[PDB]
Amino acid sequence: MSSLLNSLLPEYFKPKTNLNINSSRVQYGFNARIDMQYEDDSGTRKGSRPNAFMSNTVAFIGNYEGIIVDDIPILDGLRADIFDTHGDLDMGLVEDALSKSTMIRRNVPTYTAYASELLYKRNLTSLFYNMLRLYYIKKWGSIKYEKDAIFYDNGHACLLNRQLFPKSRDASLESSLSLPEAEIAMLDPGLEFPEEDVPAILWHGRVSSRATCILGQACSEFAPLAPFSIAHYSPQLTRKLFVNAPAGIEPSSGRYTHEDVKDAITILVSANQAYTDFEAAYLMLAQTLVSPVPRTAEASAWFINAGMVNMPTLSCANGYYPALTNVNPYHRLDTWKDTLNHWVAYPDMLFYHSVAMIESCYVELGNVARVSDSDAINKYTFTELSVQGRPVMNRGIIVDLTLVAMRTGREISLPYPVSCGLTRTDALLQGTEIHVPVVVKDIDMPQYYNAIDKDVIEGQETVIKVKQLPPAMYPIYTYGINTTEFYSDHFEDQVQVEMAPIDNGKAVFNDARKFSKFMSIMRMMGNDVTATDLVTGRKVSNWADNSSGRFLYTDVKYEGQTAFLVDMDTVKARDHCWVSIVDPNGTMNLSYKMTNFRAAMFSRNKPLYMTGGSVRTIATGNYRDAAERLRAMDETLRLKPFKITEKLDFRVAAYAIP
Amino acid sequence: GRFLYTDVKYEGQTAFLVDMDTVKARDHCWVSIVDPNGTMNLSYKMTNFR
């Protein structure tokens, strides 16, 4: 769904057609200008940060596994006459439709019996999913995965790719997969009984020598060596695949270019009228394509256990009964060919749509994790209250699109309630502390991180405990579309806090909200302050994340209640503007303004520049030549948003109906 | 049988950690706090005097 994911990008940013990705890691952000103004009891001070880079990091590494499941049928592309006055498939009219379009009327009773059983299981989403993955393996087939490389690196702790991904070796993306080929047989017209558990698809003219090899490899098993996002393990779709081609198919060549895969997809969709089936596969890949690099070491807990990708079962009966597919197809929405027309024009735009989607999900799960398990809307019952359709199960895409609705605060709508794709909320839905394996870089590691072994040596491999899941990403593209108090991602804001009395060289902050505001100010001024949690006896630091220049309360790494002892004597000066002061006095007022946003992308510690021309808009209106909006709002999936209502605690988040 | 704030025997900053799984029943004619969850609300009423 192009028009949906295209809306998530910020109004100032309009990306160009091509993007030459040449690495397994891409930073994306913006260069903003901050105009700070400070006032306290001592006096006033005015400064200005001329260039500030706020960015996340996203990679092409994510452990996933495929399962074949049975899902709903997509009834789009079938002729409009077989459907009655309502949006329902009548078997009374299928008998009539097949009868009028043949001379041999002996086969009508047999044809109707088989058609009735097959039409209620038609889904080509799994075939297009694999065909799309083959396109990007050939295009970006020079990305290197080194086993003894770094995953996260702060200075105290470190995670290697040996950990998080065991049973892996060093390989390029083209060298990862060695796909076998399934038998692409020809369906001779005259066969009366459709062979069971084998799909048949239509084709335009002669099946090319290259087109055979693509369809053969798309249906086969995926068995990777290196952990890659677009080369994840998938079960075998089918053994055989019939093709009702008037001209006979040619034998498989063995080799194909990425350009040849586009020609295979464009023909397969046009012949079968499977435009809505492609839209499902497009959204399903947008989830998987890229995975987040964690903000802090604790945010690696999300990516330990392998998330399951629900691939629908491959079934189709267009090859057997080509009478059912004619020139007047049935569609629910009039904008039902937009997603394919967008991809075929601008293939590399999927990267930006993928980054936009996975950001929105992992940002909002930062809030859902902090919700107490004694309210109406909680981690267990947030999807069920949101959805207003009838899917098979609240899994895959339904979970992800619910989180996008909660982020943007708008009603998202799909034509069919499809439940296919990655489920992320697995690490969240379990009342157990997660054991992230880490490497010790400095001797003073146990003071900061909640480590098992309290005495360590540089080189030792230990384990750290994570109870509450912290935010994996900060808002960048979705910055200021709706501002929560937790992130505090405002354009303009006036922070007011009262400074605690400095007894010896230490200031006690008993309250939780005041402590968050204090360290948030001192960070924007650019003062590396270090405080001691009195309950646990572990040191917290506002400079936890360098990439995103902000302080979240989850950097304390202790759910519950505590009091902090801030060290006011050892306040280091890392980055100093003219605003920056060391000695606060009385009531601290900081008023900042953010202006002059401009998007910038970094890859392999150099600037990554966009190539090609400017993207012209392709989009169809609500009506072509349709008079009355026959609402048909019974079967269509609808996802209602939730607004965060702030309360006194500040540690707990709460959702309400707007 | 009351607690005045001068029983702390020190004037400083206020950060009192109370662990509510080490509460022990001492006297007779007592209400039990076995395992609390959520917001607590304590209250009393003195009615007659002799």
XYZ file of C-alpha atoms in Angstrom:
708
model
C 0.000 0.000 0.000
C 2.187 2.851 -1.449
C -0.123 5.856 -0.596
C -0.252 4.699 3.118
C 3.562 4.264 3.679
C 4.356 7.348 1.445
C 2.326 9.551 3.930
C 4.642 8.524 6.886
C 7.673 10.441 5.376
C 8.102 14.078 6.593
C 6.592 16.944 4.458
C 10.051 18.589 3.776
C 11.703 15.314 2.478
C 10.943 14.108 -1.125
C 13.467 11.363 -2.104
C 14.833 10.759 -5.681
C 14.323 7.529 -7.758
C 17.617 5.518 -7.415
C 19.735 4.688 -4.282
C 23.061 2.732 -4.688
C 23.263 0.815 -1.318
C 26.856 -0.614 -0.984
C 26.902 -1.752 2.734
C 24.936 -3.660 5.482
C 24.471 -0.418 7.579
C 22.808 2.991 6.738
C 22.448 6.033 9.089
C 19.450 8.351 8.282
C 18.610 11.678 10.041
C 18.408 15.496 9.549
C 20.680 18.568 10.166
C 18.533 20.967 12.327
C 19.420 24.401 13.898
C 18.709 24.904 17.687
C 18.311 28.450 19.229
C 18.483 27.952 23.071
C 17.713 30.719 25.676
C 18.626 30.150 29.406
C 17.328 32.108 32.490
C 17.915 31.451 36.269
C 18.423 33.475 39.548
C 22.119 34.315 38.662
C 21.058 35.886 35.291
C 20.319 35.229 31.550
C 22.460 33.536 28.802
C 21.627 33.156 25.033
C 23.345 30.709 22.579
C 22.772 28.867 19.234
C 23.796 25.355 17.959
C 24.366 25.985 14.194
C 24.456 22.288 12.996
C 23.085 19.307 15.072
C 22.775 15.766 13.509
C 20.003 13.547 15.066
C 19.971 10.047 13.404
C 19.050 6.334 13.894
C 21.027 3.354 12.401
C 19.252 0.544 10.388
C 20.894 -2.715 9.083
C 20.122 -5.676 6.697
C 20.668 -8.355 9.472
C 17.648 -10.053 11.188
C 17.020 -13.744 12.154
C 13.541 -14.752 10.759
C 11.779 -18.114 9.986
C 8.876 -18.880 7.556
C 5.744 -20.998 8.372
C 3.064 -21.994 5.747
C -0.456 -21.191 7.194
C -4.032 -21.103 5.703
C -5.467 -17.512 5.340
C -8.601 -15.849 3.735
C -9.144 -15.841 -0.081
C -8.629 -12.508 -2.007
C -11.729 -12.277 -4.332
C -10.297 -9.551 -6.695
C -9.814 -10.232 -10.471
C -12.805 -12.663 -10.839
C -15.557 -11.472 -13.301
C -18.272 -9.158 -11.805
C -21.308 -11.245 -13.046
C -20.685 -14.303 -10.704
C -21.068 -11.898 -7.674
C -24.752 -11.130 -6.729
C -26.301 -7.701 -5.724
C -24.285 -7.824 -2.411
C -20.489 -8.515 -2.189
C -20.875 -12.359 -1.980
C -19.751 -15.200 -4.368
C -22.904 -17.193 -5.445
C -22.358 -20.761 -6.873
C -25.758 -20.409 -8.686
C -24.145 -17.782 -11.035
C -20.751 -19.652 -11.460
C -22.739 -22.542 -13.135
C -24.336 -19.940 -15.534
C -20.998 -18.071 -16.214
C -19.138 -21.337 -17.190
C -22.198 -22.620 -19.226
C -22.501 -19.564 -21.600
C -18.690 -19.464 -22.403
C -18.306 -22.991 -24.003
C -19.714 -25.269 -26.804
C -18.910 -28.568 -24.902
C -21.681 -28.483 -22.183
C -21.012 -32.103 -20.917
C -18.219 -30.779 -18.568
C -20.339 -28.011 -16.805
C -21.559 -30.221 -13.860
C -17.940 -31.482 -13.175
C -16.339 -27.970 -13.639
C -18.823 -26.340 -11.126
C -18.131 -29.007 -8.392
C -14.284 -28.473 -8.444
C -14.544 -24.621 -8.865
C -16.729 -24.342 -5.662
C -13.943 -26.019 -3.533
C -10.949 -24.079 -5.088
C -12.316 -20.439 -5.334
C -12.493 -20.157 -1.451
C -8.660 -20.790 -1.301
C -6.957 -18.504 -3.924
C -3.833 -16.526 -2.768
C -0.712 -15.577 -4.882
C 0.828 -13.334 -2.100
C 3.502 -15.974 -1.114
C 4.677 -16.324 -4.803
C 5.081 -12.493 -5.304
C 6.874 -12.296 -1.864
C 9.657 -14.723 -3.051
C 9.791 -13.085 -6.577
C 10.355 -9.639 -4.878
C 13.131 -11.139 -2.616
C 14.900 -12.587 -5.765
C 14.833 -9.035 -7.358
C 16.730 -7.406 -4.390
C 19.230 -10.355 -3.916
C 20.426 -9.783 -7.566
C 20.355 -5.905 -7.326
C 22.160 -5.470 -3.916
C 24.186 -8.741 -4.334
C 27.577 -7.276 -3.168
C 26.867 -6.747 0.623
C 29.451 -8.505 2.916
C 28.569 -10.074 6.347
C 31.755 -10.602 8.494
C 31.243 -12.971 11.521
C 33.857 -11.226 13.807
C 32.377 -7.684 13.248
C 30.657 -5.366 15.842
C 26.807 -5.173 16.280
C 26.635 -2.605 19.168
C 29.627 -0.626 20.635
C 29.249 2.080 23.395
C 32.723 1.976 25.117
C 32.045 -0.123 28.301
C 30.240 -3.121 26.633
C 30.271 -4.700 23.089
C 28.169 -7.289 21.103
C 29.785 -9.264 18.181
C 27.894 -11.031 15.292
C 29.228 -14.410 16.672
C 26.746 -13.767 19.563
C 23.021 -13.170 18.590
C 23.796 -15.212 15.346
C 25.454 -18.613 16.009
C 25.437 -21.242 13.142
C 26.704 -18.528 10.671
C 29.783 -18.033 8.368
C 31.343 -15.195 6.241
C 29.530 -14.844 2.835
C 28.228 -12.221 0.310
C 24.416 -11.934 -0.319
C 24.638 -13.621 -3.814
C 26.809 -16.438 -2.227
C 24.302 -16.979 0.705
C 21.583 -18.911 -1.275
C 22.057 -21.815 -3.794
C 18.349 -22.280 -4.781
C 17.091 -25.470 -6.529
C 14.362 -25.417 -9.289
C 10.766 -26.829 -9.067
C 9.200 -28.518 -12.185
C 7.331 -25.880 -14.329
C 5.093 -28.217 -16.462
C 2.709 -27.180 -19.336
C -1.112 -27.594 -18.834
C -2.487 -29.152 -22.099
C -6.131 -27.993 -22.655
C -8.343 -31.155 -22.574
C -7.460 -32.424 -19.023
C -10.883 -32.759 -17.261
C -9.951 -33.373 -13.531
C -7.679 -30.717 -11.903
C -4.806 -32.557 -10.070
C -5.072 -31.623 -6.318
C -2.406 -29.568 -4.384
C -0.922 -28.066 -7.654
C -1.753 -24.438 -8.674
C -2.236 -23.364 -12.367
C -1.494 -19.719 -13.493
C -2.181 -17.861 -16.828
C 0.602 -16.251 -18.993
C 0.862 -13.769 -21.965
C 2.213 -15.497 -25.148
C 5.324 -17.765 -24.806
C 7.033 -18.351 -21.374
C 10.623 -16.984 -21.927
C 13.719 -19.193 -21.148
C 14.619 -16.733 -18.279
C 11.002 -16.511 -16.871
C 11.051 -20.364 -16.309
C 14.209 -20.199 -14.052
C 12.653 -17.364 -11.886
C 9.282 -19.204 -11.283
C 11.299 -22.433 -10.577
C 13.493 -20.757 -7.866
C 10.591 -18.648 -6.367
C 8.676 -21.895 -5.415
C 11.834 -23.721 -4.063
C 13.168 -23.808 -0.425
C 15.354 -20.898 0.907
C 18.315 -22.212 3.047
C 20.693 -19.312 3.959
C 24.280 -19.469 5.410
C 24.691 -15.790 6.553
C 21.788 -14.121 8.489
C 20.231 -11.664 5.928
C 16.762 -9.959 6.110
C 15.779 -10.687 2.418
C 17.285 -14.271 2.433
C 15.500 -15.681 5.590
C 14.539 -19.431 5.819
C 11.211 -20.199 3.981
C 9.523 -23.645 3.513
C 8.873 -25.149 -0.002
C 5.732 -23.446 -1.519
C 4.835 -26.203 -4.101
C 6.423 -29.232 -5.919
C 4.793 -28.559 -9.380
C 3.333 -25.367 -11.011
C 1.187 -25.698 -14.221
C 1.218 -22.724 -16.714
C -1.745 -22.484 -19.201
C 0.359 -20.910 -22.044
C -1.019 -21.342 -25.636
C 2.629 -21.425 -26.928
C 4.771 -24.132 -25.180
C 7.253 -23.164 -22.377
C 11.071 -23.272 -23.054
C 13.586 -25.191 -20.832
C 15.248 -23.322 -17.862
C 18.465 -21.363 -18.788
C 20.073 -21.223 -15.274
C 21.099 -17.489 -15.175
C 18.946 -14.269 -15.011
C 19.514 -10.471 -14.468
C 17.503 -8.380 -11.873
C 15.814 -6.595 -14.893
C 14.372 -10.011 -16.067
C 12.542 -10.498 -12.662
C 10.596 -7.185 -13.260
C 9.360 -8.570 -16.672
C 8.258 -11.860 -14.927
C 6.230 -9.989 -12.182
C 4.599 -7.449 -14.638
C 3.307 -10.321 -16.927
C 2.171 -12.626 -14.011
C 0.030 -9.807 -12.393
C -1.509 -8.535 -15.729
C -2.589 -12.063 -16.929
C -4.005 -13.313 -13.541
C -5.449 -9.840 -12.497
C -3.679 -10.354 -9.083
C -3.121 -6.623 -8.194
C -4.438 -6.861 -4.544
C -2.303 -10.066 -4.019
C 0.815 -7.936 -4.933
C -0.241 -5.131 -2.454
C -0.230 -7.755 0.404
C 3.307 -8.979 -0.613
C 4.583 -5.313 -0.868
C 3.518 -4.483 2.771
C 4.767 -7.972 3.912
C 8.339 -7.189 2.599
C 8.330 -3.571 4.030
C 8.356 -5.172 7.569
C 11.205 -7.706 6.864
C 13.514 -5.739 4.427
C 15.464 -3.806 7.189
C 15.961 -4.349 10.997
C 16.916 -1.716 13.664
C 20.463 -1.419 15.163
C 19.697 -1.044 18.923
C 19.919 2.458 20.582
C 21.468 1.007 23.832
C 22.874 -2.493 24.742
C 19.592 -3.364 26.648
C 17.565 -2.909 23.358
C 19.225 -6.117 21.888
C 16.586 -8.183 23.864
C 14.060 -7.648 20.952
C 16.266 -9.519 18.373
C 17.425 -12.680 20.345
C 14.431 -15.044 19.666
C 13.655 -15.640 15.916
C 10.357 -13.926 14.860
C 7.968 -16.066 12.705
C 6.921 -14.802 9.180
C 3.380 -16.150 8.346
C 3.506 -16.980 4.559
C 0.026 -17.928 3.149
C -0.454 -21.322 1.324
C -0.006 -21.068 -2.516
C -3.284 -22.011 -4.361
C -4.765 -20.716 -7.704
C -7.374 -22.066 -10.235
C -7.091 -19.520 -13.149
C -5.168 -21.970 -15.454
C -7.944 -24.661 -15.264
C -10.982 -22.277 -15.641
C -9.862 -19.186 -17.666
C -13.603 -18.288 -18.270
C -13.899 -16.926 -14.636
C -11.143 -14.269 -15.352
C -12.469 -11.927 -18.152
C -12.267 -8.190 -19.217
C -14.685 -6.859 -16.463
C -12.985 -7.692 -13.097
C -14.513 -7.168 -9.574
C -12.591 -4.729 -7.246
C -13.672 -3.161 -3.870
C -11.453 0.011 -4.091
C -10.986 2.007 -7.384
C -7.268 2.653 -6.416
C -6.508 -1.140 -6.632
C -3.612 -0.931 -9.236
C -1.649 1.967 -7.542
C 0.869 -0.188 -5.512
C 2.154 -2.145 -8.615
C 2.239 1.055 -10.814
C 4.359 2.692 -7.996
C 6.863 -0.260 -7.665
C 7.359 -0.843 -11.477
C 8.185 2.934 -11.867
C 10.343 3.416 -8.671
C 11.683 0.053 -7.311
C 14.281 1.579 -4.856
C 11.518 3.665 -3.060
C 10.670 0.478 -0.978
C 13.820 1.175 1.203
C 12.334 4.537 2.454
C 8.809 3.005 3.017
C 10.427 0.092 5.013
C 12.499 2.483 7.274
C 9.285 4.595 7.819
C 7.239 1.473 8.887
C 9.756 -0.301 11.257
C 10.525 3.113 12.955
C 6.764 3.740 13.696
C 6.364 0.182 15.204
C 9.542 0.139 17.430
C 8.867 3.770 18.667
C 5.241 3.002 19.807
C 6.269 -0.385 21.419
C 8.495 1.852 23.659
C 5.201 3.193 25.199
C 3.187 -0.143 25.136
C 6.030 -1.857 27.159
C 5.613 0.793 29.976
C 1.755 0.258 30.233
C 0.763 -1.469 33.561
C -1.031 -4.884 33.168
C -4.168 -3.715 35.147
C -5.981 -1.380 32.623
C -8.544 -1.676 29.731
C -5.871 -1.198 26.953
C -2.699 -3.236 27.875
C 0.002 -5.294 25.979
C -2.406 -8.348 25.804
C -5.679 -6.613 24.647
C -4.588 -3.523 22.530
C -4.902 -5.182 19.024
C -8.341 -6.812 19.794
C -9.929 -3.424 20.840
C -8.371 -1.595 17.779
C -9.403 -3.966 14.878
C -12.996 -3.633 13.453
C -13.017 -6.524 10.887
C -13.019 -10.386 10.985
C -9.507 -11.815 10.322
C -8.446 -15.489 10.988
C -6.113 -14.352 13.868
C -4.692 -10.993 15.188
C -1.124 -11.737 13.861
C 1.444 -10.471 11.278
C 0.486 -7.197 9.455
C -2.637 -6.440 11.662
C -0.304 -5.988 14.745
C 2.115 -3.696 12.753
C -0.621 -1.495 11.091
C -2.312 -1.087 14.575
C 0.992 0.474 15.894
C 1.214 2.844 12.808
C -2.399 4.053 13.559
C -1.431 4.681 17.267
C 1.698 6.642 16.066
C 0.163 8.914 13.320
C -3.333 9.106 14.968
C -5.341 8.374 11.742
C -7.759 5.535 10.696
C -5.908 3.013 8.391
C -8.125 0.824 6.083
C -7.292 -2.244 3.866
C -9.820 -3.839 1.423
C -9.282 -7.460 2.747
C -8.468 -8.494 6.376
C -5.133 -10.276 5.494
C -3.079 -11.752 8.439
C 0.346 -12.484 6.788
C 3.872 -11.184 7.708
C 6.312 -10.784 10.668
C 4.974 -10.741 14.301
C 7.316 -8.552 16.482
C 5.448 -8.714 19.880
C 7.023 -12.065 21.059
C 9.817 -10.810 23.441
C 7.168 -8.384 24.922
C 4.446 -11.061 25.625
C 6.357 -13.101 28.307
C 6.893 -12.343 32.062
C 10.625 -13.352 32.070
C 13.956 -11.393 32.283
C 15.934 -11.818 28.967
C 19.684 -12.787 29.101
C 21.558 -10.614 26.483
C 25.129 -11.997 25.965
C 27.781 -9.157 26.008
C 31.636 -8.688 25.906
C 33.517 -6.587 28.580
C 35.720 -3.768 27.063
C 36.490 -1.710 30.277
C 37.060 -3.167 33.833
C 34.381 -0.809 35.404
C 31.469 -2.434 33.388
C 29.533 -4.000 36.367
C 28.952 -0.467 37.906
C 26.887 0.698 34.825
C 25.157 -2.482 33.432
C 23.149 -5.012 35.562
C 25.770 -7.822 35.070
C 25.718 -11.362 36.659
C 29.481 -11.370 37.593
C 30.252 -8.207 39.709
C 34.075 -8.647 39.124
C 35.256 -8.937 35.435
C 38.431 -8.577 33.230
C 38.773 -6.945 29.720
C 38.087 -9.815 27.216
C 35.672 -11.921 29.402
C 32.210 -12.863 27.934
C 29.462 -12.222 30.603
C 25.597 -11.853 30.490
C 23.414 -8.784 31.460
C 19.746 -8.912 32.710
C 16.881 -6.950 30.967
C 13.417 -6.924 32.721
C 11.569 -4.008 30.951
C 12.305 -3.576 27.172
C 13.673 -0.038 26.438
C 12.968 1.879 23.159
C 15.018 0.416 20.209
C 14.678 3.632 18.049
C 14.055 7.421 18.572
C 11.512 9.362 16.390
C 13.314 10.935 13.319
C 10.864 10.787 10.312
C 7.850 10.872 12.768
C 9.335 13.865 14.747
C 6.629 16.278 16.073
C 3.563 14.755 14.235
C 2.224 13.979 17.787
C 4.464 14.751 20.850
C 4.404 12.576 24.051
C 6.020 13.777 27.361
C 8.282 10.612 27.449
C 10.246 11.362 24.190
C 9.657 15.201 24.384
C 10.189 15.593 20.564
C 8.811 19.214 20.365
C 9.832 21.952 17.839
C 9.294 24.673 20.551
C 9.227 23.890 24.351
C 9.839 25.793 27.678
C 11.299 23.321 30.294
C 11.066 24.609 33.952
C 12.757 22.726 36.902
C 13.788 23.780 40.490
C 17.476 22.964 41.371
C 17.968 20.837 44.572
C 20.220 22.275 47.365
C 23.941 21.313 46.789
C 24.938 20.208 50.371
C 28.662 19.156 50.015
C 29.086 18.580 46.223
C 25.932 16.394 45.774
C 22.246 17.290 44.970
C 19.490 14.749 45.993
C 16.640 14.412 43.378
C 13.849 12.444 45.203
C 11.146 13.024 42.466
C 11.303 11.148 39.079
C 9.817 13.864 36.724
C 12.146 16.688 38.027
C 15.257 14.409 37.554
C 14.221 13.724 33.873
C 13.795 17.513 33.130
C 17.154 18.428 34.863
C 19.374 15.949 32.875
C 17.384 16.820 29.649
C 18.388 20.560 30.049
C 22.087 19.796 30.943
C 22.325 17.527 27.794
C 20.981 20.286 25.406
C 23.563 22.708 26.993
C 26.150 19.863 26.556
C 27.252 18.866 30.119
C 28.110 15.143 30.764
C 26.528 14.726 34.283
C 26.839 11.347 36.167
C 24.396 10.443 39.044
C 24.305 7.454 41.515
C 20.988 5.510 41.991
C 20.742 5.088 45.836
C 18.531 1.883 45.861
C 20.546 -0.234 43.308
C 23.969 1.504 43.780
C 24.713 1.799 39.992
C 25.883 4.927 38.038
C 23.506 6.522 35.413
C 24.792 8.892 32.619
C 22.748 11.275 30.345
C 25.317 10.636 27.506
C 24.096 7.023 26.845
C 23.238 7.419 23.086
C 25.551 9.681 20.944
C 23.547 9.342 17.627
C 20.192 10.813 18.911
C 21.073 13.854 21.124
C 18.316 13.362 23.796
C 17.814 11.702 27.259
C 15.038 9.080 27.891
C 14.184 7.953 31.504
C 14.716 4.228 30.485
C 18.550 4.938 30.456
C 18.387 4.586 34.340
C 17.786 0.788 33.723
C 15.616 0.257 36.884
C 11.783 -0.130 36.788
C 10.256 0.908 40.187
C 10.835 3.857 42.619
C 14.265 5.372 43.612
C 16.140 8.615 44.589
C 19.255 9.886 42.657
C 22.462 11.509 44.110
C 23.844 13.782 41.282
C 27.647 14.559 41.292
C 27.756 18.383 40.662
C 31.607 18.694 41.118
C 32.521 16.229 38.242
C 30.341 17.954 35.516
C 32.561 17.526 32.363
C 32.325 19.940 29.343
C 32.055 17.746 26.159
C 30.241 20.207 23.766
C 30.024 23.957 24.761
C 27.862 26.658 23.070
C 27.713 30.224 24.602
C 24.428 29.191 26.422
C 26.315 26.342 28.278
C 26.732 26.999 32.092
C 28.152 24.602 34.799
C 26.592 26.132 38.027
C 22.734 26.311 37.990
C 21.042 28.526 40.692
C 17.315 28.439 41.710
C 14.572 27.851 39.043
C 16.108 26.804 35.635
C 14.218 27.977 32.451
C 15.350 26.649 28.983
C 13.389 27.798 25.837
C 14.674 26.307 22.485
C 13.404 26.537 18.830
C 14.215 23.997 16.010
C 14.321 25.337 12.366
C 16.056 24.562 8.984
C 15.522 20.733 8.691
C 17.426 18.943 5.834
C 17.656 15.096 5.444
C 21.154 13.446 5.240
C 22.141 9.709 4.933
C 25.579 8.206 5.924
C 26.889 4.728 4.819
C 30.363 3.322 5.852
C 31.436 6.659 7.544
C 30.958 8.697 4.267
C 27.917 10.617 2.849
C 25.488 8.422 0.761
C 23.990 10.645 -2.044
C 20.667 9.939 -3.892
C 21.036 9.578 -7.743
C 18.525 9.702 -10.680
C 15.707 12.241 -11.355
C 12.799 13.628 -9.219
C 9.814 11.306 -8.334
C 6.604 12.529 -10.120
C 3.333 11.537 -8.292
C 1.245 8.560 -9.617
C -2.214 8.311 -7.900
C -5.850 7.502 -8.963
C -9.010 9.289 -7.640
C -11.881 7.634 -5.660
C -14.104 7.436 -8.857
C -13.225 6.473 -12.494
C -16.859 6.405 -13.865
C -18.645 5.082 -10.683
C -21.890 6.947 -9.698
C -22.903 5.764 -6.147
C -20.413 4.851 -3.322
C -21.814 1.356 -2.462
C -20.093 1.621 0.995
C -19.644 -2.213 1.477
C -18.081 -1.575 4.970
C -18.816 -5.106 6.417
C -15.745 -7.169 5.237
C -13.170 -4.253 5.025
C -10.495 -4.067 7.827
C -10.468 -0.783 9.899
C -7.884 0.129 12.642
C -8.894 2.845 15.218
C -6.132 4.976 16.869
C -5.462 5.476 20.656
C -4.258 8.797 22.253
C -1.759 8.699 25.220
C -3.254 10.501 28.312
C -0.299 11.651 30.551
C -0.698 11.144 34.376
C 1.265 12.063 37.582
C 3.453 8.858 37.825
C 5.443 9.623 34.555
C 7.024 6.066 34.700
C 3.619 4.491 33.640
C 1.896 5.235 30.253
C -1.940 4.970 29.758
C -4.101 4.818 26.538
C -7.691 6.190 26.106
C -10.290 6.403 23.230
C -10.186 9.849 21.486
C 1.290 3.861 70.085
C 1.911 6.688 67.512
C 4.933 7.622 65.273
C 6.168 11.282 65.425
C 8.719 12.428 62.734
C 11.310 13.307 65.509
C 11.863 9.470 65.962
C 14.198 9.606 62.836
C 16.803 11.419 65.095
C 18.227 13.290 62.006
C 17.275 16.392 59.888
C 18.290 15.916 56.190
C 16.803 15.062 52.727
C 13.731 12.711 52.642
C 14.201 9.377 50.720
C 12.731 6.510 52.873
C 12.780 3.010 51.220
C 10.125 0.729 52.892
C 10.150 -2.969 51.736
C 6.538 -4.323 52.097
C 7.512 -8.076 52.183
C 9.345 -7.696 55.608
C 6.212 -6.366 57.501
C 5.747 -8.530 60.693
C 2.491 -8.874 62.761
C 3.499 -8.066 66.415
C 0.357 -7.127 68.499
C -3.124 -8.785 68.905
C -6.387 -7.357 67.338
C -4.627 -6.589 63.987
C -5.428 -6.406 60.195
C -3.041 -8.440 57.916
C -1.262 -7.077 54.750
C -0.359 -10.507 53.168
C 0.635 -9.273 49.618
C -0.450 -5.790 48.353
C -0.806 -4.827 44.614
C -1.748 -1.310 43.308
C -2.724 1.820 45.354
C -3.174 1.352 49.179
C -5.718 3.445 51.224
C -5.458 3.286 55.090
C -8.097 4.970 57.380
C -9.365 4.911 61.051
C -12.225 6.442 63.177
C -12.281 7.080 67.005
C -15.983 7.151 68.146
C -16.266 7.199 72.030
C -13.921 8.010 75.007
C -13.812 6.542 78.595
